[PDB]
Structure formats: structure tokens, C-alpha cells
Amino acid sequence: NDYCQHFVDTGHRPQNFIRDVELIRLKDELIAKSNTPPMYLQADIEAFDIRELTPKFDVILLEPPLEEYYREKCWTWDDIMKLEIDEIAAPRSFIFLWCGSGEGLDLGRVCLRKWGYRRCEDICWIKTNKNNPTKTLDPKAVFQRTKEHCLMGIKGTANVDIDLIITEEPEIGNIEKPVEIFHIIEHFCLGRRRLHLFGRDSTIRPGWLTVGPTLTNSNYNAETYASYFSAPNSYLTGCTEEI
Amino acid sequence: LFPPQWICCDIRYLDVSILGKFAVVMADPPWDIPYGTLTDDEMRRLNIPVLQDDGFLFLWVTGRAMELGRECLNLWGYERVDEIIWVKTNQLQRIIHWLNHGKEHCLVGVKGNPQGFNQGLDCDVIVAEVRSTSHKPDEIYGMIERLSPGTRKIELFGRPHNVQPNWITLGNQLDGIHLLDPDVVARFKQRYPDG
Numbered sequence A: 001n002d003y004c005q006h007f008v009d010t011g012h013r014p015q016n017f018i019r020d021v022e023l024i025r026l027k028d029e030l031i032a033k034s035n036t037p038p039m040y041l042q043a044d045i046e047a048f049d050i051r052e053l054t055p056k057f058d059v060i061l062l063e064p065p066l067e068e069y070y071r072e073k074c075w076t077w078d079d080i081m082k083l084e085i086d087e088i089a090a091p092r093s094f095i096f097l098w099c100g101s102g103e104g105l106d107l108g109r110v111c112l113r114k115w116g117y118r119r120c121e122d123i124c125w126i127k128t129n130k131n132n133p134t135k136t137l138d139p140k141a142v143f144q145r146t147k148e149h150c151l152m153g154i155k156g157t158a159n160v161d162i163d164l165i166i167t168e169e170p171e172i173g174n175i176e177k178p179v180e181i182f183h184i185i186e187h188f189c190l191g192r193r194r195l196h197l198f199g200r201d202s203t204i205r206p207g208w209l210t211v212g213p214t215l216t217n218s219n220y221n222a223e224t225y226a227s228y229f230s231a232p233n234s235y236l237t238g239c240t241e242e243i
Numbered sequence B: 001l002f003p004p005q006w007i008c009c010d011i012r013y014l015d016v017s018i019l020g021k022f023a024v025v026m027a028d029p030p031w032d033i034p035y036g037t038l039t040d041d042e043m044r045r046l047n048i049p050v051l052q053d054d055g056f057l058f059l060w061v062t063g064r065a066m067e068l069g070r071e072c073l074n075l076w077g078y079e080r081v082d083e084i085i086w087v088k089t090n091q092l093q094r095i096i097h098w099l100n101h102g103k104e105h106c107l108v109g110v111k112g113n114p115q116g117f118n119q120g121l122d123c124d125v126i127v128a129e130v131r132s133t134s135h136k137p138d139e140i141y142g143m144i145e146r147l148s149p150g151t152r153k154i155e156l157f158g159r160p161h162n163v164q165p166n167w168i169t170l171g172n173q174l175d176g177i178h179l180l181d182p183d184v185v186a187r188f189k190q191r192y193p194d195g
């Protein structure tokens, strides 16, 4: 059966018909044990000197609010590419950049290279439409856009997850990204200094520092934050038992 | 001339100018990421720019060719305007480095100002089962036909099971040469009087 033809016939996206979206590890308890408490800071990142965010981060999750998401401030790739991300990334560290589905697939790669990362994975958020089997197509678009990409970059020197996330297309005006990206990220056991830029009250999470203009409250303190990684907790993977 | 056509050859050397202009180019390159590999400079030098005036290019990429494919795209005169994702399943509609890979990517680029294409009929996700080696899902031909009905199109690095009506297929695992279009039969004679 041709699922692309079906979509042309019925409006049901081909990914509506993927199913399964043995053996147990559940190591996530290791992660959750070593998790730092959630810290969060309201800040206008356009006007915020990101260098005041210390120490250097092992993982940065960057979710700039793109104009294409809305169809209180949209960020262009011009704004994003000028963030001084490399000034807060650890010499060995990881980035996850939400790029949307348009020009960001190119300009996000430029950003990654600009900040010193090589792209090592391309994670696709595939959006099903089971609940209502076509939006205003971007003028350059050739096809209907039913997915978004999160780019994973690495700078500096086992697999549980796949590079796909499959969830139902959220309500129009809902800009939230699937919480599953946090599960993929934490399953890598990368380092415990994890920063989420442009997070919201609703994304605050144990083990992460969340910075965004729409946070209603802040509890960030640099020395307090630094303390969570002071010896003997320095180079913990975040997937180890407590010392 | 509608029915399938093909040219067993080395794509590095065939003078593709004999073929005329196409509404759609598709290519599954053997990226250097061995067998019948092209190097990045051999890829870069492919004379893609002569195959189209206005139309679309469909370029399969993996690994570091996600970056190199974008480079070739722009070098060849194209802007990437879409990126098709083939989600791979096995029979039971079940999804078959740092992460296991469930998908292959096909960059979509545009050159010129195409007219009379049916944009937005299909979406950018293909769900199909994996088949033989580097055998891309047949759904793609249906997607491209609906997007550009009737027009002439060309596929690079294809195999015998890729020949399709309205397509000229190029590749070195094809069987000989088989051209039906009068114009292209003429030019092929003047350019290669002896095969």
C-alpha cells in the first residue's frame, strides 16, 4: 500500500500508520538519583550576557522561538547565530538545537559550525495528525511540512534510543517540543551541567538549568549551582551511583 | 518519449549535455563516507547544472553527506527548500554512533522559477519498508509524478529496478543503453558515433 497516495486521498499523514510508538533496563533511576535540583532563571537572552551563566556546560538545549512556529518575541536565525554559545560550552560538550523545518535546517548547521560543533545526529520530530486528517504552506515549500528537526552537535573528543520522536501534532499556537527529547538527551550519560535556553515554566526539570524570558520565577545562584559539581562530583557522567 | 530509458555508463564521464533539460533530477550518490564511490571533488564536479533550467532536485544524503550534499546542492545552483524523510519500517509497520537510525533523508532543492508544479500535494514523510541495498522507496516516483505530471525527469546512480516511464536512468549496473526519445537519440549519435 502507498501511504503517500493515501495521504493525497484522505489527508491521513503516512506516519499516522506507524505502530509501536521485550527486555528492561530502566536505568533512568541512576539519572534521577544523580540529578541536580531544578534551577531556573528568568532572563531576556537578547539582552542577557550569557557569560554570567557559569560554569561551562556539558549539554546545551537550545529552543529559540522561531517565527514559523506561530501561524512575545520571535527570534530570527540572524539573532540566533549571534548568540555567543561557544563562550559557555565546555571544551567537550554537546548541543541540541531545534531548527524547525525550513531554512533552519541549513542555518542551524551554520550555527553549529560557527560555535565549534560537528553535527553527529539529526533527530526528527514526526508529527501525526490522527485527530484531524493542511496549513498555510510556506511560499518556498514543495511539500506539506509534517516534521521538525533537532540537531545534535559535538565539540571535543551504549545506544538506547532511535533518532525519531513520534507524537501527535499539537494544537495551533502550542509551541511546546516533545518532552521525549529530554529522555534521549539524558540517556546519553553526557555530563550533569545541562542548560536549556528558551525553556519555560512548563519545561523546568530536575538536572537542568532553565533560562528564558517567560519564566515567572528564578532560583538561580551561580555559586549554589557551581556547588553541585564541586569535588568529588566533577566529571560524573550523570549515570553513576552516588559517591 | 514516455517509456523507460537508461544508460549504463560511468556518470563521471558521460557528456550529459546530450540529454536536454529535465523538470526533476533525482540522485542517490555513492558518497565517500569503496565499491563505486565518488570523491567529494568528483561529486562537486558532476555537471548537474546543465540538466535543468527550472525545476527540482531530489538528493539522497546520509552521515556527513548531509553537509556535503548541501554543499553540492548550492554549488550546482540550487536552494534547498524541503527535506524528505523516509521512515524505515519492516512488514509489521514497525520502525526497523549515538542513536540508532530509523530514517534516510532526501534534500529537495529548487533551481530557477518552476511553473505548473503541484506543490503541497504530498507531505515530507515517507513510510515504507526497507528493501534491497540502496533501494529507495518507490513511493518517491509517485510523489514526483503528482508534483510534475508528464514531464521528463532523470535519475542518477539508478539500478534496473529504478527505470520508470518519463525517466532516463543513469548508472553502471544497468544493462547496456536504451534510448527512445528522438532528440536524445540524435544527440547521442553525434556525440558518440561508436558507443
Ligand SMILES: NS(=O)(=O)c1cccc(CNc2cc(N3CCC[C@@H](CO)C3)ncn2)c1
Binding pocket: B009, B010, B011, B012, B030, B035, B036, B037, B038, B157, B158, B159, B170, B171, B172, B173, B174
Ligand atoms: N568504471 S566504473 O565501473 O563505471 C566506476 C568505478 C568506480 C567508481 C565509479 C563512480 N561512477 C559511477 C558509479 C555508479 N554507481 C555506483 C554504485 C551503484 C551503481 C548503481 O547502478 C551506480 N554509476 C555510474 N557511475 C565508476
